Design a protein around this ligand. Structure first.
Ligand SMILES: CC1=Nc2ccc(Cl)cc2S(=O)(=O)N1
Ligand SMILES: CC1=Nc2ccc(Cl)cc2S(=O)(=O)N1
Ligand SMILES: CC1=Nc2ccc(Cl)cc2S(=O)(=O)N1
Ligand SMILES: CC1=Nc2ccc(Cl)cc2S(=O)(=O)N1
Lengths: 471, 469
């Protein structure tokens, strides 16, 4: 069972003895620190609040286990038994903490306050930063959601340019990252973040997370289609690739089906097997059930362009109203190897240069989508900005001489609309001057209870692209 | 509750319809595919076997739940309900799978078989690759342990060169990565993989994992010391940094204490605050309880060197027998910002250039150690190499025309010591010829039961550096 007393960085165990004497309040905030990715999608805090922070999170047993662990971990007794006991006895194990946050799904420019944390009991001044570690892990769903949205922006731009519309945009980037992430828990979190922007996923773990913690009107938030892997093609034997292909597309004759085609020779597979030997099985398929040919190796751009040129000569190509080439509706391509935000851009631009519509292709991404990201990408960071000691509030901050990029904000913070309709973060309690209207943060957690929640449908709406929003 | 029927890539739900008819056996293997990082530490499988694969993992309720989810997920009825029913009825929900693996901790060159997976009942040919997704996640503890070990190699080389020994090597790289990883579960797994090589960690989650799944003779596998953060310094006010420092070092006067010193001006803090105003509180400290000064911003190399030069002029420096400069034993430095394998190398080389012993410094690493890694780094990969169809075994593989690096191995595999004492993977069942020694892969899982386990102590022993031996 999860124990919040054992879910912090070790050194934080010793912090209650390092704050100024008579400190009654510690107030801290989270931002994606300023100075690509000029704006971030705020998503994932609600998961952490519900799974880890709400309700009775302290018991006599959890206190004793933490005590015994830290005794050996530090080779000394430095653990704050009395402080944790106080929470157990006074509040029945419910955290005396208030957290305020921007609504989930909101798209906010870098350098803005996203959430704030403070203790609501003066005895629990040390509690605010004890929970830094688990709250800061929100960097991950934020970063996945943000990077996934940036890829949607690229896809939207080129789909609109080459086709005249955005039909099917939300299925253009499929999550293939289940095997390439660091754990089962990470898989569920990351896949959910991607589903903020898209509807295609093979990372099943994401579905149950959204259903439990966020909720959608629809039965599931994400979808998949039948698809082969190398084992189901190569198992037939090297001389029987065609037999495998025929069996698979015949088994899945009335639903869309993806078939990895590069086991031995992608170009032969496209031109001779699909393009000649099995062509009669492809041209008979329905628009609702296309064959989706999947290259999976080689230079991504070069391979996509050559696959398209091959198919364009074996199948009847049309020219859409924008002047771009379009495969028949029973035949599509998915590129699911080497795809990240950089190569995605290079592929779609290269397709556009060669007059291929983005209608023809979809992308899959695994490691690039869910694993190749760090806290450093958006500079997600939690810092103390305000304390009260001897009854006096002081504005605190760090400001390292050799890195102005690491300077933190001062004092009590609030988030506001500017006269032009943008975001601004006010420091030093200046929000109380009321020159900038109401604070846009909401209390989302207070004294062990979740006080404000968002459905996954609301989050998706908040996270929409401006291009989509242009009705 | 975790449901194995829901813990695979979606498309694998459809694969039982795609394999050749009359297939009784699907045999697959995991390797860190060839084409730095020439050898990998095998660690983490035992965690997965115990937490996810062993015992009764199939129930009626789990089958129904999966059926319901997949109906909506695919907008179609594809789902091998009968296959899963069979496992439930015939084997009380235990997986009819055999897994053979190299012992955990083993250090193996790239491009060798590390573990193999096969069904033990012909009805369950589809099950071997169902569990690919969960098994392949072993890439993470493998890669963390491997990358951590490579950093230990660098530290050892430079510590030996500048000091003549390896004293304290196992405390030279501390795990600061708890806040920088993607989840609580990842935190525990990653921290445990680092502790294969070192003993210093702030990622508390790793301790409980090792105790539950591996075990150590000592009470805990990893340790920490009291340390400040920016909040405990800055809370005192901008004009009171010295007061914060004095309070903290005095609270922790008889144990090592790390104090972040870059809140406002690291160089001022080292030269005027530690080096003058509070010098008297430092030079009095025990050798077992030094002050550990922690810079946390700026160019990692330039900052470490400037800090050492400042400290060397305010405190009595000696020259060791190798000719390198050494701070007094009550004063040490930790660099815990921007450290990864590349920058670690650049810092120790830079220190050696300026005649500073590696004895003087330790390193902390967070995102670089536990998060900035992918499955692509060592090319961790799981592929089918052997199937039996109509009673005939056939060796199977992929070999993409445009990428020879992705060619996979053929047939039944085994791992052997070579006459010169190296490793070789034999393909096409050639291991049965017994021209080499015994197969180094051992059965670790069979039909729902974990059949061979390793302690964390054994794993650390297996993962030792050559220079340590
Ligand atoms: C549906 C589908 N699923 C996948 C999952 C993982 C990978 Cl790695 C590849 C695919 S696909 O491209 O065959 N399509
Ligand atoms: C053509 C195509 N269709 C799909 C339909 C549904 C899903 Cl969930 C995914 C795809 S695709 O991206 O593989 N390409
Ligand atoms: C000098 C020093 N001592 C330590 C003792 C124990 C641990 Cl666990 C870590 C360290 S250090 O690496 O911060 N530096
Ligand atoms: C003991 C110790 N713990 C830390 C944990 C996280 C960070 Cl980020 C920094 C440190 S330390 O360098 O103060 N030493």
């Amino acid at each position: 069972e999860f124990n919040i007393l054992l879910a912090t960085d070790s050194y934080k165990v010793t912090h209650y003895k390092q704050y100024p004497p008579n400190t009654s309040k510690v107030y801290s905030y989270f931002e994606c620190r300023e100075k690509k990715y000029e704006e971030t999608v705020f998503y994932g805090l609600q998961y952490i609040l519900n799974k880890y922070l709400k309700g009775k999170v302290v018991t006599k047993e959890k206190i004793q286990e933490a005590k015994d662990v830290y005794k050996e971990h530090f080779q000394d007794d430095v653990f704050n038994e009395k402080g944790w006991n106080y929470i157990l006895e006074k509040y029945d194990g419910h955290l005396p903490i208030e957290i305020k946050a921007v609504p989930e799904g909101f798209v906010i420019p870098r350098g803005n306050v996203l959430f704030t944390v403070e203790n609501t009991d003066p005895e629990c001044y040390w509690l605010t930063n004890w929970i830094e570690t688990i709250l800061v892990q929100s960097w991950y769903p934020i970063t996945v959601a943000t990077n996934s949205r940036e890829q949607k922006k690229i896809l939207a731009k080129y789909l609109l340019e080459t086709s005249g519309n955005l039909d099917g945009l939300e299925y253009k980037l499929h999550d293939f990252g289940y095997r390439g992430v660091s754990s089962q828990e990470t898989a569920g979190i990351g896949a959910s973040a991607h589903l903020v922007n898209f509807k295609g996923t093979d990372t099943v773990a994401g579905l149950a997370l959204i259903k439990k913690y966020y909720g959608t009107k629809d039965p599931v938030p994400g979808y998949s289609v039948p698809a082969a892997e190398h084992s189901t093609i190569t198992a037939w034997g090297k001389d029987h690739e065609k037999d495998a292909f025929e069996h698979i597309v015949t088994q899945f004759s009335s639903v869309p089906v993806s078939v990895v085609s590069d086991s031995y020779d992608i170009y032969n597979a496209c031109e001779k097997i699909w393009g000649e030997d099995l062509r009669h099985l492809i041209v008979s398929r329905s628009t609702q059930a296309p064959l989706i040919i999947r290259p999976d190796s080689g230079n991504p751009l070069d391979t996509v362009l050559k696959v398209l040129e091959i198919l364009g000569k074996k199948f009847p190509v049309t020219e859409n109203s924008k002047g771009y080439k379009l495969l028949p509706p029973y035949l599509r391509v998915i590129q699911g190897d080497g795809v990240d935000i950089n190569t995605l851009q290079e592929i779609v631009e290269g397709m556009k240069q060669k007059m291929w519509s983005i209608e023809n292709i979809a992308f899959g991404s695994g490691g690039g989508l869910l694993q190749k990201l760090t806290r450093d990408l958006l500079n997600c960071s939690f810092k103390c900005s305000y304390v009260v000691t001897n009854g006096l509030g002081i504005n605190v901050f760090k400001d390292p001489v050799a890195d102005p990029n690491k300077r933190s904000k001062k004092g009590r913070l609030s988030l506001h609309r500017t006269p032009a309709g943008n975001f601004v973060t006010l420091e030093e309690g200046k929000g109380d001057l009321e020159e900038y209207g109401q604070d846009l943060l909401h209390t989302v957690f207070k004294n062990g209870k979740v006080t404000k929640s968002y459905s996954f449908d609301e989050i998706r709406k908040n996270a929409q692209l401006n291009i989509e929003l242009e009705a």
